[PDB]
Design a protein around this ligand. Structure first.
Ligand SMILES: Cc1c(C#N)cccc1[C@@H](C)Nc1nnc(C)c2cnc(N3CCOCC3)cc12
Length: 430
């Protein structure tokens, strides 16, 4: 029934040297030729294989090479001749177009990063002149052209800085309710923009990390800037009574971060408070009320163990949420290092793809908050390091900490004020 190997490379049957399954199918390993064959199997459909493959195929196959394989598998060279066209030719051709649907619909970034890859896809779909494959070709063409063309929020809160005067925006001049709202809207968009393929194969820690993981790095370096900006506002406020107001305001921003389920912002404040320059400021935290001490304690307990307390709280809240990327990136690297690579190992890619879907399920629901473009651009313009590098700026923050609160033998100096506006916080309630 089946052709030969010279005419069709997908003719060699399954054996121990190609395709390896698990216990009861679910594929564990195999060659790329066999991975495409089972991805387009004629006896049944497998949507779980398609979604996991197209998400993790770039870890073992290249996009230009994948298109050449699905086209090679598509172009297959009368008691059985009419049956072979219905039991093998027609169903396999439908499975190839099904992958093409899922490829352009959910992984279109591969095409807008390689124009030659998209041109070949449009030429292949144009050559498909079947009869039953018409509705699939129509759907593929519609998705391609669509991709190429591609209640009431509450009142915005203001404190000292009047609206429109972006030149006076600061941590104490802006309302802490609005600081967390805009940072939540800012971080939510940075989270929703991350594609799962940017986490497969540790591509964000390799050579081409900018073009393969453009959205993940932008999410990471934003967390670094806002954390360092929190630490910079604290240590550079030499006045003790003024630094207490700075830290207390960041605790109030954590309160709103918790009301909006922005766990990235909560742990950004946590990471800034646990940093070496901020954690040793014993004189500052003594004047912080016990109510704000408990809030920082509970937020830190989310980081104990492997964020297991954060995971438990995440599984008990609802849509409007901004997850934390760190705990998932850690579990991916240990899995991508624990499991090997070849036995090629596909259960490793599946195990990594299972982790991506856990943090991806919150990438749909938006926040019922109105965007403030001036406040948004202010936080987008944040660059606390400046010209200095990462290690040189963190060493400055700690030396600034050893200066504003010298260690045990030295006394505690008194420093002049730096903020001329009132320091009383407006409030945490809308
Ligand atoms: C509550 C608070 C305050 C005050 N007041 C002031 C600052 C921070 C915090 C939180 C956010 N950090 C922590 N909280 N509770 C424990 C039991 C912690 C135990 N260990 C740490 N680590 C910090 C990093 O180096 C290793 C030790 C942090 C803890």
């Amino acid at each position: 029934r089946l052709p030969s190997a010279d005419v069709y490379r997908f003719a060699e049957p399954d054996s121990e040297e190609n395709i390896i399954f698990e216990e009861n199918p679910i594929i564990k390993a195999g060659t790329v030729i066999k991975l495409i064959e089972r991805l387009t199997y004629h006896m049944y459909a497998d949507p779980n294989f398609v979604r996991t493959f197209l998400t993790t195929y770039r870890s073992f196959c290249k996009p230009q090479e994948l298109l050449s394989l699905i086209i090679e598998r598509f172009e297959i060279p009368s008691a059985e001749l009419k049956r072979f066209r219905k039991e093998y030719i027609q169903p396999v051709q439908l499975r190839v177009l099904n992958v093409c649907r899922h490829w352009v619909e959910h992984h279109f970034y591969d095409f807008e990063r390689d124009a030659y890859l998209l041109q070949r896809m449009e030429e292949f779909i144009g050559t498909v002149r079947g009869k039953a494959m018409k509705k699939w070709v129509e759907s593929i063409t519609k998705i391609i052209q669509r991709k190429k063309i591609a209640s009431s929020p509450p009142t915005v809160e203001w404190h000292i800085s009047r609206p429109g005067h972006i030149e006076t925006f600061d941590l104490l001049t802006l309302h802490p309710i609005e600081i967390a709202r805009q940072l939540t809207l800012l971080e939510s968009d940075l989270y929703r923009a991350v594609q799962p393929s940017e986490l497969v194969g540790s591509v964000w820690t390799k050579e081409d990390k900018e073009i393969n993981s453009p959205n993940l790095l932008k999410m990471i370096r934003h967390t670094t800037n806002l954390t360092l900006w929190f630490e910079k506002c604290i240590v550079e406020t030499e006045n003790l009574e003024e630094r207490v107001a700075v830290v207390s305001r960041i605790i109030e921003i954590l309160q709103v971060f918790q009301e909006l389920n922005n766990f990235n912002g909560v742990l950004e404040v946590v990471s800034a408070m646990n940093s070496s320059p901020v954690y040793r400021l014993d004189h500052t935290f003594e004047q912080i009320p016990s109510r704000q001490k408990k809030i920082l304690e509970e937020a830190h307990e989310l980081s104990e163990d492997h964020y297991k307390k954060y995971l438990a709280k995440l599984r008990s809240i609802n849509p409007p949420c901004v997850p934390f990327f760190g705990i998932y990136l850690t579990n991916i690297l240990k899995t991508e290092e624990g499991n090997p690579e070849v036995l090629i190992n596909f259960s490793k890619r599946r195990k990594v793809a299972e982790i991506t879907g856990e943090i991806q399920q919150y990438q749909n629901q938006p926040y019922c908050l109105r965007v403030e473009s001036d406040i948004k651009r202010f936080f987008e313009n944040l660059n606390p390091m400046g010209n200095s590098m990462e290690k040189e700026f963190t060493d400055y923050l700690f030396n600034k900490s050893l200066e504003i609160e010298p260690r045990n033998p030295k006394p505690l100096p008194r420093f002049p004020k730096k903020y001329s506006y009132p320091l009383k916080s407006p409030g945490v309630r809308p």
